[PDB]
Design a protein around this nucleic acid. Structure first.
Ligand SMILES: [Mg+2]
Ligand code: NA
Length: 317
DNA sequence: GCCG
DNA sequence: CAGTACG
DNA sequence: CGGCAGTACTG
């Protein structure tokens, strides 16, 4: 990156729009900020005239005036928004109600079960773990899984799979290549991890149902010097394994770019599958289902979209 | 915010 | 349902 | 003008 004086100033702006709920403008900035990672400004995709102008103001002037006049509410909104389970609406509401610190939130705010947990682990959830710790967390989930049923497939996705040194959490994808081998596997896996005292909190866990798709919660390895880590587990049918793998590996931007591409071909891509001949209206909204395509591997999904394959490492963007 |  | 979250 | 990804929970 040859433009950090510029990007870091836009970045602040990106986050400010994001936390204030102007999500499409934030999206716009995020693209431009990755491009950078006047005539020449426009030349790059993701960078329009209005973005170009802001770069020239930084290049020429050295300050950025929209930066100067960012609402002073924004740092507090970002403080609040980093509570897991709280987003831009809740953060604004709290602000409106006069709250300005986590101490206020603690003593005065009404909190959902999820938000109380997020607050309890506020610092921990802002940290990233060394990818080696992610390895141990995966192995812990895997061995519990495989004990119940061997041959089961367990794999760490997200930033871990993309080869990052550090991970914000652990994403464990579980599947069985032997058809429909899992009935109430969540019941047993989670009970298993609870008995070990490995899980510390649950954020999202609809266990009253049966067809629980995901578990999102909190875990902590045994011994001194350990922090609470976020853990997401999903169990999928084997036929959906490549698409689940692709989804859960990300990046989020990579996924959305790829999904947006499929939409351009009358196709559709989700955690579940890649479909063809999807019927959508003038607003881009699905009005008729297409038809699931065979995708035994990730390479198939790429191939069926007419794309060259990309290793997980090359999917940060 | 960008872009078709 | 709105809000938040997952990648 | 208007889409910007497509999903899964909570309450
Ligand atoms: Mg939050
Ligand atoms: Na992750």
């Amino acid at each position: 990156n040859h433009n950090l004086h510029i990007t870091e100033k836009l970045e602040v702006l990106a986050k400010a729009y994001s936390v204030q709920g102007d999500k499409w403008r934030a999206l716009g900035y995020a693209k431009a900020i990755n491009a950078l990672k006047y005539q020449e400004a426009c030349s790059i995709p993701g960078i329009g005239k209005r973005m170009a102008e802001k770069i020239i103001e930084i290049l020429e002037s050295g300050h950025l005036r929209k930066l100067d006049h960012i609402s002073e509410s924004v740092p507090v909104l970002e403080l609040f928004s980093n509570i897991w389970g709280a987003g831009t609406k809740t953060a604004q509401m709290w602000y409106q109600q006069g709250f300005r610190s986590l101490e206020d939130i603690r003593s005065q705010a009404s909190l959902t079960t999820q938000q109380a947990i997020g607050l309890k682990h506020y610092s921990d959830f802002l940290e990233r773990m060394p990818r080696e710790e992610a390895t141990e967390i995966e192995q812990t989930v895997q061995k519990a899984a495989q004990a119940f049923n061997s041959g089961l497939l367990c794999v760490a996705c997200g930033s871990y799979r993309r080869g990052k040194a550090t991970c914000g959490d652990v994403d464990v994808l579980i599947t069985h290549p032997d058809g429909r081998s899992h009935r109430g596997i969540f019941s047993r896996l989670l009970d298993s991890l609870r008995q070990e005292g490995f899980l510390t909190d649950d954020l999202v866990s609809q266990e009253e149902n049966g067809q629980q798709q995901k578990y999102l919660g909190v875990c902590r390895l045994p011994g001194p010097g350990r922090r609470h880590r976020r853990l997401d587990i999903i169990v999928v049918p084997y036929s959906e394994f490549a698409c689940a793998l692709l989804y859960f590996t990300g990046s989020a931007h990579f996924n959305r770019s790829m999904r947006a591409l499929a939409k351009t071909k009358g196709m559709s891509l989700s955690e579940h599958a890649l479909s063809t001949a999807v019927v959508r209206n003038t607003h881009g909204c699905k009005v008729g289902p297409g038809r699931v395509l065979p995708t035994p591997t990730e390479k198939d999904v790429f191939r069926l979209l007419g794309l060259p394959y990309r290793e997980p490492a090359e999917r940060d963007w």
